């Protein structure tokens, strides 16, 4: 009855452990270093085929064909470089809240409010798309989908768990339950041995692919987190919030590294990711505009302000070459 | 441009015109969120009218989509902001739950949640004061004092009804933009989804007029 | 499967008129490029017309532009080739062709069997072998050199290479001189430059035997070459 003393003991050893090894004071090291100064970016190309707010994007691995989610339930698959589209997909369930793209660039897996991530088929014979499998058994909703490989699928739902599932047989073969609150987002690795889960309960969790028990426990949020991506090492990654924090934490050390924070706002973090380099922070507001933070001195580089509503995604490609930030407007806009 | 891309953007053009013509296709219908506590009576107007449940009907030349979203147990502020520039609000609320359990208390914090929601500043609220052919009877015995202290009057239904939807209808504090519509669900018509009807119009007409730029 | 068969063929006197039906079956024919080409009984291949997706462009041969009409229907999933005023230089093989053309597409993928129809400036994509024999087991190159160079600006070099068999429907081995057909094994390997082409087949087996025809697709015309035939 009373081991729950004994749990928040551990809990209090745990915190003094990690704090008694922690003279990071990160911002005194990097003062040696020379700031970026000021960076501005130019609408290059203006993505514009939707007829209402859309809600993901994904870059594939070509950093040319991006997959962008919608809410009439029309995933369409640009084509980056001629504003040309390759494929309207008519999902069923018209609620959508996520989309992954196949490393390879075969499958689009889409699913939002209805507990079922449908994965698609893309490079196939006999023209048109097809829903090749319904991954079902969520009891909240899926909230983000992601690839590990054309076989692996790992799901982020509203039911305070994450599912890794099998594609061949369509069945959760390994899940993962350690959450209080609805796990809103999900970020897999470099080496794709290792990701990261956001959940609700303002507290981040590193998990294992492979054997399934997490490895690390980060708190230090005061409200709801919205969005995770690793640092392109593997070694760290930013968490953007509801309290309009931007934060960094270390894989390695098991705290927080430093914090990103300006007075003046007061709305949440949608979405966050880092440069191909990993030097800038990529961070979407609700001010309907995204800041491009300094990710080593905490000092704000440039804002890109050209929306009319709040960006609900933001993709890097992974060669750096362009941002494309997704807003409420029904347009996406490709940044350089 | 070259031979091939020349196609490419046959194809993109083409697919865009398929795209246009489906979302206009679609638009033309209109949708109503179906809000409802818990056992409030969200079964009953569903089939007496005909994760998420999709449910269509057609009345009078109009293609109406119900979504209830009452089968589903998630936080509401993080998926509520997906259900903007829905049309109208069905809120069923239990009158015969008054003294079951506080339940009204219950669907009076939910009616004010919603209502003053930064979402649904806009939107009309249509809600059906249900079940009240069990409600007539059980102030007979058990007068509307229990839940309510700071009511003093008669234990008249006509009455009753009448200070109930006074109270639920006082809730809104933006008066000048949402209006509130209420009906005592009849189980011997067709006449509840004329009623949804009546409001849906009423709404569209006044809509399209502030759409016109004269309002 | 796909399923593309032809019919209305046999013999027609000269200034007759006949109409062809190529029935596709067993794919999504609304959203095709459908490609018209015939083959003479002892000639290379040569392009006879093009409809596009949903009926929105066509285009047609210098040799039978004026003459030759050609319409599809969606609901039936049916494509007319009707010809009148028939020459003698028209005597031929017929394949209906489908192709699909979008970002990291393979069009001129398959081919139908055809019919046989008898009476009673551009790109010339010279093809300079004509005729070699091989013994099975080794590894042997096919060029042919272009008249225009075909690398465009935006990076890419539109060059197909098609293989023939003996009695056979011509199918889709190589396009863009770089990515494999779909279903062909990996022995087959295109490289080269601007005006510069070559298909290297490694470690040649049987199944391979038959004639190998490159085909530009830089501007309309498209058109064939003479073709190489390995012997046995």
């Known amino acids: 009855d009373q081991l729950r003393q004994e749990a928040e003991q551990l809990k209090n050893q745990i915190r003094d452990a990690r704090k008694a090894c922690a003279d990071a004071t990160l911002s005194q090291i990097t003062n040696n270093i020379d700031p970026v100064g000021r960076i501005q970016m130019r609408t290059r190309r203006t993505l514009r085929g939707h007829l209402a707010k859309i809600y993901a994007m994904h870059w594939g691995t070509d950093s040319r064909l991006l997959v962008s989610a919608s809410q009439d339930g029309k995933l369409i698959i640009w084509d980056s470089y001629t504003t040309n589209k390759v494929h309207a997909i008519p999902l069923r369930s018209s609620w959508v809240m996520t989309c992954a793209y196949a490393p390879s660039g075969n499958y689009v897996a889409c699913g939002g409010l209805d507990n079922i991530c449908s994965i698609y088929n893309l490079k196939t014979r006999e023209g048109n798309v097809r829903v090749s499998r319904e991954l079902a058994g969520h009891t909240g909703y899926l909230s983000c989908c992601r690839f590990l490989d054309d076989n692996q699928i790992v799901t982020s739902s509203g039911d305070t768990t994450c599912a890794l599932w099998d594609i061949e047989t369509g069945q959760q073969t390994t899940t993962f339950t350690g959450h209080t609150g609805d796990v809103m987002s999900l970020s897999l690795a470099p080496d794709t041995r290792l990701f990261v889960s956001g959940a609700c309960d303002a507290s981040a969790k590193l998990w294992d692919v492979r054997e399934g028990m997490c490895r690390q426990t980060f708190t230090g949020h005061e409200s709801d987190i919205n969005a995770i991506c690793f640092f392109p090492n593997g070694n760290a990654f930013a968490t953007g919030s509801d309290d309009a924090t931007c934060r960094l934490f270390d894989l390695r050390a098991d705290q927080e590294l430093m914090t990103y924070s300006h007075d003046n706002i007061i709305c949440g973090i949608t979405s966050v990711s880092f440069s191909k380099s990993g030097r800038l922070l990529l961070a979407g507001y609700d001010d309907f505009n995204c800041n491009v933070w300094d990710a080593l001195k905490a000092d704000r580089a440039g804002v890109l302000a050209g929306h009319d509503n709040r960006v609900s995604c933001l993709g890097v490609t992974d060669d750096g070459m362009a941002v494309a930030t997704g807003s409420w407007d029904s347009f996406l806009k490709i940044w350089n | 441009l070259s031979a091939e891309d020349k196609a490419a953007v046959e194809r993109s053009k083409m697919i865009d015109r398929n795209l246009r013509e489906d979302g206009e296709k679609a638009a033309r219908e209109v949708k109503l969120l179906l809000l409802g506590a818990g056992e409030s009576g969200k079964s009953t107007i569903v089939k007496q009218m005909k994760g998420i449940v999709e449910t269509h009907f057609t009345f009078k030349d109009l293609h109406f989509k119900m979504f209830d979203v009452g089968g589903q147990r998630s936080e509401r502020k993080k998926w509520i902001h997906c259900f903007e520039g829905v049309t109208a609000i069905i809120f069923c609320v239990a009158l015969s739950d008054y003294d079951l359990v506080n339940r009204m208390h219950e669907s009076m914090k939910l009616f004010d949640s919603i209502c003053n929601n930064k979402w649904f500043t806009d939107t009309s609220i249509i809600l059906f004061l249900n079940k009240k052919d069990l409600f007539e009877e059980k102030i007979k015995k058990s007068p509307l004092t229990i839940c309510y202290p700071e009511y003093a009057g008669s234990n008249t239904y006509e009455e009753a009804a009448a200070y109930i939807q006074c109270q639920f209808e006082d809730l809104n504090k933006r008066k000048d933009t949402k209006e509130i519509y209420t009906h005592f669900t009849c189980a011997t018509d067709t006449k509840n989804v004329q009623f949804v009807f009546d409001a849906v119009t009423d709404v569209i007409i006044k809509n399209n007029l502030k759409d016109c730029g004269l309002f | 499967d796909v399923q593309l068969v032809e019919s209305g063929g046999g013999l027609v006197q000269p200034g007759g008129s006949r109409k062809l039906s190529c029935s596709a079956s067993?794919?999504?024919?609304?959203?095709?490029?459908m490609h018209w080409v015939r083959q003479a009984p002892e000639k290379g291949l040569e392009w006879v017309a093009y409809?596009?997706?949903?009926?929105?462009?066509?285009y047609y041969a210098d040799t039978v532009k004026g003459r030759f009409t050609i319409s599809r229907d969606d609901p039936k999933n049916t494509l007319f080739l009707q010809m009148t005023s028939l020459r003698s230089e028209d005597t031929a093989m017929y394949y209906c062709?489908?192709?699909?053309?979008?970002?990291?597409?393979?069009?001129?993928?398959?081919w139908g069997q055809g019919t046989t129809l008898t009476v009673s400036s551009d790109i010339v994509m010279t093809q300079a072998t004509s005729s070699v024999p091989v013994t099975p087991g080794e590894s042997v190159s096919i060029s042919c050199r272009s008249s225009?160079?075909?690398?465009?600006?935006?990076?890419?070099?539109?060059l197909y290479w098609f293989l023939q068999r003996p009695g056979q429907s011509p199918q889709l081995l190589i396009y863009?001189?770089?990515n494999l057909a779909s279903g062909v094994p990996d022995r087959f390997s295109g490289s080269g430059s601007g005006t510069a082409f070559t298909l290297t087949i490694s470690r040649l087996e049987a199944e391979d035997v038959g004639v190998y025809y490159c085909?530009?697709?830089?501007?309309?015309?498209?058109?064939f070459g003479a073709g190489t035939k390995l012997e046995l």
């Open positions: 062709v489908r192709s699909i053309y979008y970002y990291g597409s393979s069009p001129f993928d398959f």
């Open positions: 067993g794919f999504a024919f609304s959203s095709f490029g």
């Open positions: 409809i596009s997706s949903g009926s929105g462009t066509i």
């Open positions: 225009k160079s075909l690398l465009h600006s935006n990076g890419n070099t539109y």
């Open positions: 863009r001189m770089s």
């Open positions: 085909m530009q697709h830089l501007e309309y015309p498209l058109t």
